[PDB]
């Protein structure tokens, strides 16, 4: 909590979105342990380097000062945990992967027809939609019908 407030307080010193993005990249910890000034020399824009260097220096100093302090409790053991990361003010990631649309087809149906189908496995219930195209009677949209697939074991 205290780490989030201080980093956001440092971000509040930069009003431009270019400065915020350059600062947000600075507080993010690189996977390999490169020195902050050594890391800050890479960025190609000096107008981006100045806020990047200041935020990277403040983030590393704050992170090491707060290091080894967390995980309070009555126990005398110390849990090993990675350094706190900034929780982004960028948009959160909504789920994007969904099972592929089986039964995506068009079938010639005379008055009525029954389809024998094999159900792919999943825990989410799905609904089946339908569109009827008749040369004489035209388009019709079927009402959705629910099919809940579940697993006992």
Partner 1 sequence: KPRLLLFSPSVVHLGVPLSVGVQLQDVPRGQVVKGSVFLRNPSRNNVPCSPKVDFTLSSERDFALLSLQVPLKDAKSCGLHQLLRGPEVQLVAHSPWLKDSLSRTTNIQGINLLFSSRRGHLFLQTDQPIYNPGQRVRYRVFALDQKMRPSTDTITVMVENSHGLRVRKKEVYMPSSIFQDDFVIPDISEPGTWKISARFSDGLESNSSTQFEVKKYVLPNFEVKITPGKPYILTVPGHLDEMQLDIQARYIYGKPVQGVAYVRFGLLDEDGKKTFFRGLESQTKLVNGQSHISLSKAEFQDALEKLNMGITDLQGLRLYVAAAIIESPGGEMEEAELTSWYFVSSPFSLDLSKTKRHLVPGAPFLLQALVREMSGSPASGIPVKVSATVSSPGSVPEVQDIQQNTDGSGQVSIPIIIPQTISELQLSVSAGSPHPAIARLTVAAPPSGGPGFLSIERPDSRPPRVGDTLNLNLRAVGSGATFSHYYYMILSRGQIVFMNREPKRTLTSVSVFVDHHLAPSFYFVAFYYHGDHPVANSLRVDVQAGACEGKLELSVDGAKQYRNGESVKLHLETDSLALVALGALDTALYAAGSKSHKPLNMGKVFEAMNSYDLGCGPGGGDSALQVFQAAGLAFSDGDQWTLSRKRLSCP
- Where does this chain bind partner 1 (CB under 8 A)? 1, 4-5, 8-9, 12, 81-82, 87, 89, 92-119, 121-143, 145-152
For residue 59, the surrounding DSSP H or E stretch is: helix 46-65
CA atoms 56, 60, 66, 69: torsion sign: positive
Count the alpha carbons within 13 Å of 104 in the hemisphere toward its beta carbon: 4
Q: Of 28 and 35, which CB lies nearer to partner 1 in the complex structure?
A: 28
Least spacing, CB of residue 15 vs partner 1, in Å: 13
Q: How many degrees, rounded to 5, is the angle at CA 4 between CA 12 and CA 92?
A: 90
Least spacing, CB of residue 22 vs partner 1, in Å: 20
Q: Of 66 and 122, which CB lies nearer to partner 1 in the complex structure?
A: 122
Q: Of 18 and 125, which CB lies nearer to partner 1 in the complex structure?
A: 125
Least spacing, CB of residue 41 vs partner 1, in Å: 29
How far apart CA 90 and CA 101 sit, in angstroms, is 31
Q: Of 76 and 118, which CB lies nearer to partner 1 in the complex structure?
A: 118
Least spacing, CB of residue 150 vs partner 1, in Å: 6
Q: How many degrees, rounded to 5, is the angle at CA 20 between CA 19 and CA 26?
A: 95
């Amino acid at each position: 909590v205290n780490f989030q407030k201080a980093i956001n307080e440092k971000l509040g010193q930069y009003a431009s979105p270019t400065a915020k993005r350059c600062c947000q990249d600075g507080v993010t910890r690189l996977p390999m342990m490169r020195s902050c000034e050594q890391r800050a020399a890479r960025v190609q824009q000096p107008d981006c380097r100045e806020p990047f260097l200041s935020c990277c220096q403040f983030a590393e100093s704050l992170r090491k000062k707060s290091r080894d302090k967390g995980q309070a409790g009555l126990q005398r053991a110390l849990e090993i945990l990675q350094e706190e990361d900034l929780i982004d003010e960028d948009d959160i990631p909504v789920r994007s992967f969904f099972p592929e649309n089986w039964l995506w087809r068009v079938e010639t149906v005379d008055r009525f027809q029954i389809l024998t189908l094999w159900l792919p496995d999943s825990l989410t219930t799905w609904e089946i939609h339908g569109l009827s195209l008749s040369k004489t009677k035209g388009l019709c949209v079927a009402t959705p019908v629910q099919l809940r697939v579940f697993r006992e074991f």
